[PDB]
Design an enzyme around this catalytic site. Structure first.
Site, PDB file in Angstrom:
ATOM      1  N   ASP A   1      -0.340   6.837  -3.624  1.00 38.64           N
ATOM      2  CA  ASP A   1      -1.464   6.429  -4.451  1.00 38.64           C
ATOM      3  C   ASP A   1      -1.867   7.543  -5.419  1.00 38.64           C
ATOM      4  OD1 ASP A   1      -1.909   4.268  -2.731  1.00 38.64           O
ATOM      5  OD2 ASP A   1      -4.112   4.617  -2.543  1.00 38.64           O
TER       6      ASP A   1
ATOM      7  N   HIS B   1       0.849  -1.169   0.000  1.00 38.70           N
ATOM      8  CA  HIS B   1       0.000   0.000   0.000  1.00 38.70           C
ATOM      9  C   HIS B   1       0.900   1.238   0.000  1.00 38.70           C
ATOM     10  CE1 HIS B   1      -3.835  -1.933   0.272  1.00 38.70           C
ATOM     11  NE2 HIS B   1      -3.247  -2.819   1.047  1.00 38.70           N
TER      12      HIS B   1
END
Ligand SMILES: CCCCCC(=O)SCCNC(=O)CCNC(=O)[C@H](O)C(C)(C)COP(=O)(O)OP(=O)(O)OC[C@H]1O[C@@H](n2cnc3c(N)ncnc32)[C@H](O)[C@@H]1OP(=O)(O)O
Ligand SMILES: CCCCCC(=O)SCCNC(=O)CCNC(=O)[C@H](O)C(C)(C)COP(=O)(O)OP(=O)(O)OC[C@H]1O[C@@H](n2cnc3c(N)ncnc32)[C@H](O)[C@@H]1OP(=O)(O)O
Lengths: 359, 358
Positions: free
Chosen positions: A156, A126
């Site tokens: 992200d 992540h």
């Protein structure tokens, strides 16, 4: 469909984090976005507003017919987005080469964290992982404490979806002169590093150190940090330029002659203590008033639930009401071909319908 | 010139922050970028690697000749970038309306913090100011402390330059139909708000609160945070999904039966205490070994100076060397029209020489 990207056709293979975000922005700017999800997950109108400006279809991509239907979509599209681990689309029979057979014009856009190859390329991950490896996470937070994740904004979105977008749109431009698509490989560990190029520039000129909390822009500088006010709420100070810094001091009621120099770093602790005491003597709203129309670079730090009440936000329509609550309008803004307000997440529609629509 | 944007012509009115970062990336991807600075500014070859992939030229835009040489460049270009306060280009006679008269194909890209209108449109600011107003800054940092700025990554770059880029490139696509340019209005307060659209979505569905340090992705979750190791260095844990979390636990040597449930938020204090003590029992590079090739979502928190030794970084050539320090290679990457290594900052060039060349 309003926006500069009217008539762009995008097929999105459903995933999480950056791919949906990029898809969203394309949609926002008026692309025709078709998201393929698996039938197992979709049931109900989705209540993830990140799925705005989409048509959702389901399809078991592991079946013969699901694959077939998907390749028919892709044949009719300009861009494909996938955010799976490397190898995944290939084994579905949806890899770059299979797509090039049905459509040599496709922009084939691959969104990963670690990239298409190399030792970490099959590791789950992540945002916090991708930014840990390239120096970014280490640089964020106070010096006496462990690093703090800047939500998932830097790997992200900033260093992820945004670089996927820049690559998709640059490749579309290249296609105009070449007639051909190509593969865009957007890795979060790469994008986020370019995102933070300014720090790499500064480190090479001896103007940034690896010590956390000791730099101009990391919270170490007393004139670029938040301060707690008398009511326990916060202001932000960003007064880098000496002119703006001087203006801030005057409005705090502090005589510059009694203070250490702005950029004498050895005395920053001392300067900070003086500014802390000054800011603490009135509440946030007082400072917002005092410094309105000012170049002092002092702003109230609003919580999400207060943003709808801020004049500058309201009057530029940065948000629209939906749903449960407020969402950001498309960005950026365009003079002639303006985006419209996003369409809420649609009911699942059948994939044949779409193919009719797209001939 | 290598890369997908080969042939693209860019004029950049020298600024700070997002504008040069956007111009850099256009250059990085093959654009022909010409940067107009004031002469009372440039004193040799630039030390600032952000000004890579550029030609620099000098021009007093307040004079008549400066203005006219600049309007000549713009007449021959695809894109203009300016990041001055609203009204600066108008008053200079380089406003959109004036440019539209010498080149109606121009993409007119305006990079600000607050936008082109509204009460704050004339106030000076930096990254921290723009993210303070839209809820972002308040959400960053520990719950027991004041908010901490995420450097200038979220307003300047992620929510600034990158949205400017998307606008520019989206407008180039539109120009393919219309034969006409237009104005791109990129404000950091807007772009950073779209950057955080996830939190606004989760907020609506009750999956995100305004309490700092008490959410899944802000440091509140024990399985999404950093941990101090035995040597005082750190690892990052990102084990959101239960299967990755279970893999992390096994590598730590904790039996799941002895811990509270991963997502019982009421027992997050106990869980954090358990994970804290476990990670603290060995050094960062131990954990890095244990978890390499694993889906446990545990990675070493490297300092800038150590990045150049990480195998995965080296092998993908994320960085190149230049002028006593590494710099990032262009991103993203392109299969057929690959970018090349950036060209360093050059000596200033003559504005005539450029008009000629063009
Ligand atoms: C909490 C989220 C917010 C925060 C997000 C972040 O911080 S960043 C976002 C996370 N990181 C990334 O996105 C980087 C790239 N992606 C990944 O690394 C990975 O997708 C992941 C770690 C997120 C998850 O790994 P998984 O093992 O679940 O998924 P993986 O991507 O390997 O493969 C997905 C599987 O779904 C299958 N699949 C996909 N769509 C399908 C469909 N319509 N019908 C049938 N099957 C389908 C594929 O065929 C594949 O099967 P097989 O099993 O046969 O191969
Ligand atoms: C690297 C440093 C920190 C980076 C980290 C961050 O967080 S950066 C994010 C910074 N913020 C922004 O960029 C948002 C938008 N910009 C701004 O708000 C503003 O530019 C600013 C606050 C940064 C700086 O304000 P100033 O008041 O210095 O400048 P402002 O932009 O209003 O006006 C610029 C002046 O330069 C003149 N000018 C510009 N180029 C010129 C040229 N080649 N020759 C002659 N004159 C020129 C204009 O005519 C004008 O002068 P006159 O008014 O005299 O006619």
């Amino acid at each position: 469909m309003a926006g500069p990207l009217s008539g762009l056709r995008v097929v999105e293979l459903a995933g999480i984090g950056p791919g949906p975000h990029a898809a969203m922005i394309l949609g926002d700017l008026g692309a025709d976005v078709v998201r393929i999800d698996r039938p197992s997950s979709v049931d109900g109108i989705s209540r993830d507003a990140m799925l705005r400006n989409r048509r959702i279809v389901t399809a078991d991509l592991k079946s013969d017919q699901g694959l077939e239907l998907a390749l028919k979509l892709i044949a009719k599209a300009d861009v494909l987005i996938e955010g799976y681990r490397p190898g995944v689309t290939e084994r579905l029979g949806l890899g770059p080469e299979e797509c090039a057979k049905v459509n040599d014009r496709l922009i084939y856009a691959r969104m990963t964290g670690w990239g298409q190859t190399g030792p970490r390329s099959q590791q789950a991950g992540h945002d916090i992982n991708y930014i840990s490896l390239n120096g970014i996470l280490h640089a964020i937070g106070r010096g006496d404490e462990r690093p703090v994740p800047p939500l998932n904004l830097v790997g992200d979105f900033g260093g992820g979806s945004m670089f996927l977008l820049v690559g998709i749109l640059a490749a579309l431009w290249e296609r105009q002169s070449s007639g051909k698509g190509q593969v865009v490989d957007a890795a979060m560990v790469d994008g986020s590093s370019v995102l933070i190029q300014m720090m790499w520039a500064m480190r090479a000129t001896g103007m940034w150190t690896d010590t956390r909390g000791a730099n101009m822009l990391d919270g170490g500088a007393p004139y670029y940090d938040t301060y707690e006010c008398a009511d326990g709420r916060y202001v932000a100070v960003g007064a880098i330029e000496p002119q703006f810094y001087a203006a801030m001091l005057a409005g705090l009621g502090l005589d510059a002659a009694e203070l250490p120099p702005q950029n004498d770093r050895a005395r920053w602790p001392e300067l900070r203590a003086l500014l802390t005491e000054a800011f603490a003597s009135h509440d946030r709203d007082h400072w917002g008033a005092v410094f309105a129309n000012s170049d002092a670079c002092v702003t109230p730090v609003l919580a999400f639930g207060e943003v709808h009440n801020e004049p500058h936000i309201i009057e530029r329509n940065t948000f629209y009401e939906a749903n449960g609550g407020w969402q950001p309008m498309p960005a950026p803004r365009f003079s002639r071909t303006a985006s419209s307000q996003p369409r809420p997440p649609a009911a699942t529609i059948d994939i044949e319908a779409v193919l009719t629509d797209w001939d």
